Design an enzyme around this catalytic site. Structure first.
Site, PDB file in Angstrom:
ATOM      1  CB  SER A   1      62.385  25.020  36.038  1.00  0.00           C
ATOM      2  OG  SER A   1      63.189  25.774  36.929  1.00  0.00           O
TER       3      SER A   1
ATOM      4  CE1 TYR B   1      69.661  20.372  38.267  1.00  0.00           C
ATOM      5  CE2 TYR B   1      68.829  21.098  40.390  1.00  0.00           C
ATOM      6  CZ  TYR B   1      68.632  20.468  39.179  1.00  0.00           C
ATOM      7  OH  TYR B   1      67.399  19.936  38.880  1.00  0.00           O
TER       8      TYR B   1
ATOM      9  CE  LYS C   1      67.131  22.139  35.811  1.00  0.00           C
ATOM     10  NZ  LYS C   1      66.797  21.553  34.484  1.00  0.00           N
TER      11      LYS C   1
HETATM   12  N1  NAP Z   1      64.691  14.189  40.245  1.00  0.00           N
HETATM   13  C1  NAP Z   1      64.493  15.394  40.910  1.00  0.00           C
HETATM   14  O1  NAP Z   1      64.361  15.405  42.106  1.00  0.00           O
HETATM   15  C2  NAP Z   1      64.440  16.739  40.103  1.00  0.00           C
HETATM   16  C3  NAP Z   1      64.162  17.906  40.742  1.00  0.00           C
HETATM   17  C4  NAP Z   1      64.115  19.073  40.042  1.00  0.00           C
HETATM   18  C5  NAP Z   1      64.348  19.070  38.700  1.00  0.00           C
HETATM   19  N2  NAP Z   1      64.630  17.894  38.046  1.00  0.00           N
HETATM   20  C6  NAP Z   1      64.876  17.912  36.610  1.00  0.00           C
HETATM   21  O2  NAP Z   1      64.017  16.759  35.873  1.00  0.00           O
HETATM   22  C7  NAP Z   1      64.683  16.431  34.766  1.00  0.00           C
HETATM   23  C8  NAP Z   1      64.801  14.900  34.650  1.00  0.00           C
HETATM   24  O3  NAP Z   1      64.850  14.337  35.948  1.00  0.00           O
HETATM   25  P1  NAP Z   1      66.254  13.588  36.442  1.00  0.00           P
HETATM   26  O4  NAP Z   1      67.419  14.462  36.182  1.00  0.00           O
HETATM   27  O5  NAP Z   1      66.166  13.309  37.907  1.00  0.00           O
HETATM   28  O6  NAP Z   1      66.460  12.157  35.593  1.00  0.00           O
HETATM   29  P2  NAP Z   1      67.909  11.496  35.320  1.00  0.00           P
HETATM   30  O7  NAP Z   1      67.761  10.006  35.196  1.00  0.00           O
HETATM   31  O8  NAP Z   1      68.857  11.818  36.480  1.00  0.00           O
HETATM   32  O9  NAP Z   1      68.529  12.143  33.893  1.00  0.00           O
HETATM   33  C9  NAP Z   1      67.643  12.876  33.050  1.00  0.00           C
HETATM   34  C10 NAP Z   1      68.028  12.670  31.553  1.00  0.00           C
HETATM   35  O10 NAP Z   1      68.849  13.611  31.142  1.00  0.00           O
HETATM   36  C11 NAP Z   1      69.755  12.893  30.032  1.00  0.00           C
HETATM   37  N3  NAP Z   1      71.006  13.677  29.748  1.00  0.00           N
HETATM   38  C12 NAP Z   1      71.804  14.299  30.618  1.00  0.00           C
HETATM   39  N4  NAP Z   1      72.819  14.876  29.918  1.00  0.00           N
HETATM   40  C13 NAP Z   1      72.636  14.600  28.614  1.00  0.00           C
HETATM   41  C14 NAP Z   1      73.347  14.927  27.487  1.00  0.00           C
HETATM   42  N5  NAP Z   1      74.622  15.764  27.642  1.00  0.00           N
HETATM   43  N6  NAP Z   1      72.932  14.512  26.292  1.00  0.00           N
HETATM   44  C15 NAP Z   1      71.794  13.760  26.185  1.00  0.00           C
HETATM   45  N7  NAP Z   1      71.098  13.438  27.286  1.00  0.00           N
HETATM   46  C16 NAP Z   1      71.517  13.859  28.502  1.00  0.00           C
HETATM   47  C17 NAP Z   1      70.040  11.754  30.543  1.00  0.00           C
HETATM   48  O11 NAP Z   1      70.248  10.706  29.457  1.00  0.00           O
HETATM   49  P3  NAP Z   1      71.665   9.874  29.450  1.00  0.00           P
HETATM   50  O12 NAP Z   1      71.967   9.390  30.853  1.00  0.00           O
HETATM   51  O13 NAP Z   1      71.551   8.680  28.515  1.00  0.00           O
HETATM   52  O14 NAP Z   1      72.811  10.804  28.968  1.00  0.00           O
HETATM   53  C18 NAP Z   1      68.794  11.380  31.389  1.00  0.00           C
HETATM   54  O15 NAP Z   1      68.026  10.459  30.702  1.00  0.00           O
HETATM   55  C19 NAP Z   1      66.076  17.047  34.901  1.00  0.00           C
HETATM   56  O16 NAP Z   1      66.236  18.028  34.004  1.00  0.00           O
HETATM   57  C20 NAP Z   1      66.120  17.627  36.353  1.00  0.00           C
HETATM   58  O17 NAP Z   1      66.960  18.867  36.395  1.00  0.00           O
HETATM   59  C21 NAP Z   1      64.677  16.739  38.733  1.00  0.00           C
END
Ligand code: NAP
Ligand code: NAP
Lengths: 253, 254
Positions: A135, A149, A153
């Protein structure tokens, strides 16, 4: 020999979730899925017969059934499902909203998971496994231009509570990773930030990096890994917590 | 004259009762409604006359949302409130029997249709310091059996009320739940989707709720949704999720 399915494992917290999973155990098999083919083939070259990848968009149910049936046709087992894939766009003020872009956001962070669980739930019930949702803190806090966004969540927290209360054979949980040094914060600092986001929250997301208070991708990924490897406790089944909650202290690095 | 209110789902249940209360407490208020059933709308036109206008069509299409907003400015020149009282309960189903395409159509009625209408009317809402009233439900916090898509869509709408109230300080958003009301939706619960997808214990809670005469008349919560649109939303509850009988919302009770 737990079988764990993780989404979006090409970058950010996703690739590290499978990195920590292959560090605490040598018999755990992980089936990953993402859209970028190059970083997924590098994971299999590095881990071999412990990692298997499906390259496609999770919004397409054709590749969702490809990921689930490959784990059953390869190991006949489904233990855990870590939904660690999502987008941030559209990052826009309420005065400049594109509704078709909001549904595109909802089709990746919510509708993609509701369809993913419904396909893997019959196999998850056969092992009485765990469903761990990744989340965010934006489900109850205000963030500028995070209307899509943030509520994205919030619906995941309800789907985590409903799943844990409906089918008690499996256990569901939704844990926020905090603020992690991924490519999402890179998008917040150098792209969608100065364009549509405000000034107060922008300097926070950037000031938290130069002073080195951004978590590495492996700090919260260890929580999702142990929750997917050992199981979800009974007292927190269906709740929404954060990675550093004292109830999840037994899942920290 | 007075204020102009836009109320959705002015056919059944609470949405029709909001129209009856708005005209019950004021004589300058004109309501612009929207719904898919022309039978109860053409009847409301001949009851109040030039105080009521309606648009027949589904809120999933933006051509109906723009036709309701543009009619409110070419007729009276302003929009002073927004009452989002339009929702659907189906699909009610188990987690093992989930239809994603059917889950989206609920979101495109209870969430995506509302977020589309707020932005189309936002240029007019800010010119009058308007108040956007969201009709949520108790299912955003508590668990209800097989209420997967419905309970989760209200949770997304409540977060949007806080986002709208924190981004545009010129508007005032709130999400108030009506409790459990004697409407057409509760009749569908005890007879249709109840002995189909939902549990047994929660239905004996809902069917016993009607036999105990505990079902609220739609006149009680509609007064809160109507008074919030007329007198305006207070600042101490701006962007929060509350219920109709919250002590902070006492001045909006009959
Ligand atoms: N970083 C933060 O500060 C933070 C805070 C709160 C929550 N989160 C959550 O943590 C999780 C991962 O962190 P992040 O978002 O920061 O890493 P990210 O590098 O920005 O992306 C996360 C992964 O999601 C994949 N993805 C997105 N859409 C996709 C699709 N339609 N099909 C297949 N793969 C898909 C992407 O792979 P591809 O690029 O190859 O498509 C990527 O590897 C997320 O869900 C995010 O909401 C992050
Ligand atoms: N009754 C309760 O116990 C309860 C509890 C909690 C929350 N609520 C919420 O209160 C609100 C109204 O109460 P209710 O559901 O009980 O009344 P209802 O009898 O179920 O009628 C729902 C209203 O929404 C309209 N509507 C639905 N889809 C529409 C669309 N696509 N386009 C235009 N209009 C549409 C309907 O008009 P048409 O059918 O003619 O299109 C109708 O007027 C709902 O949003 C509900 O979620 C009710």
């Amino acid at each position: 020999g737990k079988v764990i399915l993780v989404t979006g494992v090409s970058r950010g917290i996703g690739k590290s979730i499978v990195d920590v999973l292959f560090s605490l155990d040598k018999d755990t098999v992980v089936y990953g899925v993402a859209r970028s083919e190059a970083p997924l083939k590098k994971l299999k070259e590095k881990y071999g017969d412990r990692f298997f990848y499906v390259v496609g968009d999770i919004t397409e149910d054709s590749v969702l059934k490809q990921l689930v049936n490959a784990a059953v046709k390869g190991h006949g087992k489904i233990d855990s499902l870590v939904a660690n894939a999502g987008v941030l766009e559209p990052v826009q003020n309420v005065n400049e909203i594109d509704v078709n872009a909001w549904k595109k956001l909802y089709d990746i962070n919510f509708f993609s998971i509701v369809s993913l669980v419904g396909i893997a739930l019959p196999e998850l019930k056969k092992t009485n496994g765990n469903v761990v949702f990744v989340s965010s803190d934006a489900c109850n806090m205000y963030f500028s231009s995070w209307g899509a966004y943030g509520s994205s969540k919030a619906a995941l927290n309800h789907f985590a509570m409903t799943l844990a209360n409906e089918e008690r054979q499996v256990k569901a949980i939704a844990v926020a990773p905090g603020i992690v040094d991924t490519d999402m914060q890179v998008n917040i600092r150098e792209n969608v930030g100065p364009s549509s986001m405000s000034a107060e929250q922008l300097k926070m997301f950037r000031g938290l990096k130069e002073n080195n208070q951004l978590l590495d991708s492996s700090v919260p990924a260890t929580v999702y890994a142990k929750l997917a490897l050992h199981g979800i406790p009974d007292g927190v089944n269906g709740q929404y917590l954060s990675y550093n909650d004292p109830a999840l202290a037994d899942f920290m690095p």
